[model samples]
Target: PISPIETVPVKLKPGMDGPKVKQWPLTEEKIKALVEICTEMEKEGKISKIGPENPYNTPVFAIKKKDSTKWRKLVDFRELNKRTQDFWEVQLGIPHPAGLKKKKSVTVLDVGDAYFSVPLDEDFRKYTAFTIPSINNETPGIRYQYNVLPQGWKGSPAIFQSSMTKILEPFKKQNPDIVIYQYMDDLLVGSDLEIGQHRTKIEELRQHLLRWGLTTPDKKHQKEPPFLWMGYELHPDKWTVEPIVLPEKDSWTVNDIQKLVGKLNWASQIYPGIKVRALSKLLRGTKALTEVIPLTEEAELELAENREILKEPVHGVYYDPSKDLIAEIQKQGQGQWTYQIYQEPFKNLKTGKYARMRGAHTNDVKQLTEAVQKITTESIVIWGKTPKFKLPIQKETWETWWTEYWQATWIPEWEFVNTPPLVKLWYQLE
Candidate 1:
């Protein structure tokens, strides 16, 4: 069933004749697979055979699924996407798992064929049209236009997310206790209740989703601790990232490096405030995707360091506003500066002493101040070398200087102290 949300038709910029790109050459095996996919989609009424009179026709390609022979059909809508109007701006942010409450159990629901579930506007179907190349001098090629949202379209995710948000709004308001987080079609239903109660809540949510025509596969119904969500292994106490396996080769193409960088970037999020500087060598001086670049000695070393960092698990940090919040800034040799904001470790009734967990690693002074502001507005202990000011500084002048530099009103109660002794140890160890 199609989504209840009204379809926003893809609109093109004025004076643009949509993309008329030719299809890529495919092997016989791929051609057969494409034909099978087209036939299946046609039967399902997701796509239909269209006449050659349609001016905009993009090519189709296949991406092989991991550990499987199945191929996912994708349309190259880059050219057409550039010609289209701006996408929906009200995009939903995916909540980080680290920020979620500790739960006894979590159920993950994966919406099957997410994009296709939303019907494409009838007028925009022509722009979503794609063509398959002929197999030989004997067989003829076919053209089909999608009746639903097509994969690889730039605006698909935003559109789908907007619709999904509307669909879940009522359910969210009804069940205030159940913590449901939606990242596109994947719904992470978290509950601190017992297993039996959690299951009942999940069933209620599933029924609500099914009513909206959103279906989740039986195999994707995961309700267990240490569950995998958004590429991180989620546990009650911590979240760990799986290290990306690098190909064993001396040389690499730009595409290979790009993919590696993308994976590492995602993994770096759980790392919090640490800045990643290792992948710059692989990215430097690279322009084209197909161009082969040999790995330098430093590049190999950087890749190894990145892999090592990803192996560490991110322990959960419980925020206690009552405890002392401290901000520490250190100049790590030469011009490098880093800041860390953490709450002082305090005794907990059940879990004992809470570990001092740093918030983020950022080099920018403005970001450091902003991070501190986001955490708390109360007076905080600043442990770092004070910024050098000009001579003959009055109290009023100092306050003005602080306000101008920090972009916040200077608090009289805020204390500035010497950098902690551990900062010296950390520098020496590094």
Candidate 2:
């Protein structure tokens, strides 16, 4: 008999290694734990539907740490929970200051990132609007094959969601009055106030994420009236993305330069104008090195030692337009990398002063001197980097900034695609 251990080119059969499961799964115990948690809450039904039906049993990557004995996530979306939403609560309609009142325009929230992404369950679907083949079976003499992007498959939401949700449990707890929910990456958060009041509430949520490690990828986070959520668009006449001011000759990185600079690079098409000191400073600070050392070889590591401690080449602070290159077609329409001060403003659980946002609220807002602020200063990263979905099969060509698509227009088209900039997405809620 031939030895069982062997290498034969066998076609990947269904149920055998199946297909890739992209996200992680909670244990049966974990599910029950969650169920028990929800059961105890008066809002359990709301909590159950807040996240898309589990997104369970998906494939997620976990790896052992280089310096520690404990396993660490190599591609964990749990951190993304910081930016993703888990339903929030708010007054559904207008308030009459405090007591006796008349009904007004109901308070509507543009949850998640303003777009409702209908998960493309290709396996459950054939292709296009028609032509679906029977489930789990090969058609005889058909000469056609169909594959559905499974619903609840792991990572599908994360990849799709990078375009959405950017908050977490802590932020939700901070603002008991506002409710936030995310599907894939799409987020829906509500405040009983009109669009204006909702905008301020959204800001607080964004700040809470800044406190955590989440970020709102404005370029991917969209929000505009009867705002779109989960592929469903609603009419909205309220809430707007907050604006920022920058120096005309600034060559420095402030809290969120990306929202400003990235928008400028993008604004070339729309209104054909908005001013900023030339994006030369942006060119100076941003960079990417895709293929570095091989993963197996230690010397080929992607980050240098002391992973977070990065600085530009010594004495290279000043912006030099002459040294910078304009967007090439590939990068022009492809994903982008912009850096702001990445923060993981966690309440150093290891520190004594970690309970700042608790209670009806603590004392951190008034005086920095007496707050329970235990921060480690970890970086907060949000990359709407590539304009690609997790496992996109189609080869959609992206238009470049140098091309006619983005020439001297104003308000840039990508703005419509990657809405709700980080400046608005990274605020604290409670």
Candidate 3:
């Protein structure tokens, strides 16, 4: 039932170098399987036989199934994506089911071989070809290329999204009441409307898919209640955060800190009063290469604190109001915004400094400005010592101060700082 819809051809950028063909080596039985799959595809006109003179060639690799011996072939298009103009489309984010109000039934549909549902022309298809080594001399040498959009094209998702949007437009026009969400290959129908409304839209979508030479599995055809979207259960005005089992204190490693930071950052979107920067020390000086800082005791406690905060029913409570602050920090260097934010002070073994950090974003610009001014009065510290930020702290002067105060001066080895200092403190104080 698969057929072609040819509106645009697969155009490789002119005057760009194409990749060399590299066919994966496989066992004799696996080679035969590859041959059979290609052969069947050619018979169905999904791919075409081509000569050795095609303008482009790319390597194909295999990903083995975890529980089976099957291989899913993949094409390497890194070179192609670089040369070609990138096409991208932003899809809608998942909406809460509460926004739907009174819908009972939920329907979800995943397109079959979703990428192949969009097709290309013969002239374009000729650009994609790879050679397989001769098998037992029965087949001297073999080459085939996909006539449809192949599995691993760089701009395939955007291309397919454009095509599928056209296919779904007619249904949208006819049914004004039915709600539908289509993102890439996934489609959900009937959110705010009744179950009967959902029934019509699903069949309407199925008929169009069949007419356009795409198929959906029988299992994928069914729908049920309490719909899941974006991996969260959809409920009325409230959703649940999957419980996080905290790792043991010593179990966390460098990668675990990175993962933990990432999880807390995501959860911060939902949870209120989640001071994200309590764990910022772990992310200091991170680059793409050997980038992670080693995990420390302070960072481990930071993660534990965040895990406890995530356990509370705090979703939908927070308003993220630091967009301006975040953007300025990301684009420019941190300007004159410093607050003497404190936590229960501890000996920072990494730097041998006693510091307390209770860090979170705030909406009050006035409060932020006041905090910065107050900190400057107590201690003004400069690293690069920018000329405009005139204070008692200059780079040369601050360098001497930093060493004397943080590194040299110590009444005791274990004692660290809190706002209440003269009250006799050491390692024993919590």
Candidate 4:
């Protein structure tokens, strides 16, 4: 579980919690590091290295109302979050099993204020102050307090996201073709930011967020061009958190160190700590909620789940994915969309180039689309690239250099790299 963009925007003050949540595996180091990052952002200033250099050139336009005459302040929904519901008691439609409790860990959203989507009052906008796009534009983008143009606050992320849901509803009502979602600043405007609808959807998104008091750096923002969402660098041709920030980065997000530490099954491998340090941001100050509980209780829960869920495995497989011949199915236009760091030495270099890609794929929008068109099929493809690391052997592919290559990975007890376990598990079982 890689660390989320920033965090779940909605604060966990008992009421604002939602049903769908994101969870990541992490050591104690990463969780606190992340919290510290945020705390530091609040205390000292933006991260010097990662901080906004000079967010804007010209000053923001005087805060004028877009529809000042029609700007009747909205009722603050902030209080509604605290309205005690039957949350703990009255479980929602979600039903797992009575004896087996599968609790979904709440994830932090990685955007700005959630209220920007909704029209709020002066008081609401000031403290618990939800930031919105400037009524004016200057290099035009979502900027906040003199710093990173602020769109996507803790509350902002949701409000704008739900706004995306509502705006697309009419299109959905008219034609179930559009798949619009609001990831705070980066709006998944248009039909699918997947293949063709990049430009049109982007403009549609730009127009849409503006209506909701959300601002997009139109000049900087491109239609389906590589964009940043949360901490990811999204490809215009492709959209998903997997590309920019590998899911392995999520290991640094686990609230508890054990989820990461206990996973380090290897004798002297670096995963337990090596993997932990990479996420030094999140684990800065937070302690695992599980850490507070008694060890006996934790063990009891583990054994119970083990007996029922983590049963025995069938043999004859190198990896769980290999055992069931699922890769073969994917080769046949079926199976799963799993991945490997690099391919077999006989294949990776001979077949493809492994290049360490960073920043946004904005430039490769055309290149990626072109390459994917030429080489990719429904079949599974694997390769490696050059590592952009400063360490020794930084210029090596996974196959030729995995021994010394630097890349994100999960080293829980055993090295947990490559495709997602559950998905890969399904293929193996199948």
Measured by TM-score, the strongest candidate is 1
What's the number of clashes in each of the models?
2, 72, 0, 53
Q: Of 1 and 4, which scores higher on TM-score?
A: 1
Off by over 4 Å in 4: 1-152, 160-162, 172-175, 189-197, 208-217, 221-430
Q: Rank candidates by TM-score, best first.
A: 1, 3, 4, 2
Residue lDDT tens for model 1, 321-372: 3344444444333333333344542111111111122343343333334333
User: Which scores higher on lDDT, 1 or 4?
Assistant: 1
The lDDT of each candidate is 0.51, 0.26, 0.42, 0.27
Candidate 3: 10-residue stretch with minimal lDDT: 324-333
TM-score of 3: 0.41
Off by over 4 Å in 3: 1-15, 59-123, 133-141, 151-163, 173-204, 211-430
Predicted candidate 4 versus true structure: per-residue lDDT over 1-430, tens digit per residue:
2222322222233534322211222223333333443445445332122224322111111111121221111112222222211231122111212111111111111123333324433222222222123222323232223122233222443334444466546445553444333332333323333333444444454455456555443333113333323222222223121211122432333443334333322211311122323233333455664343223334434323432322322222222221111111111112112222212211111112212234434332223222221222111111111111111111222222221211111110112133323223211111
lDDT of model 2, residue 51? 25
lDDT of 3 by residue, 258-291 (tens): 5555555544544545654646665565555344
Candidate 2, residue 56: Cα displacement in angstroms equals 21
lDDT for position 398 in model 3: 33
Error of 4 at 275 (Å): 30
Q: Write the per-residue lDDT of candidate 2 for residues 1-430, one digit (tens) a residue.
A: 2222222111222223222223223233332333343234214211122122223221222222122232221222222221211111011111112110111122222232222133333342221111111223444111111121222222334333433333356665766665443432334444456546555666666566445544442322334342432222122222122222233433233323444345444433322333444333433444432212112223213122312222211222232322311110111011211111111221111111112222333322211211100010100001111111111111222211111111110111121123223322222110
Residue 250 C-alpha lDDT in model 1: 28
TM per prediction? 0.42, 0.20, 0.41, 0.26
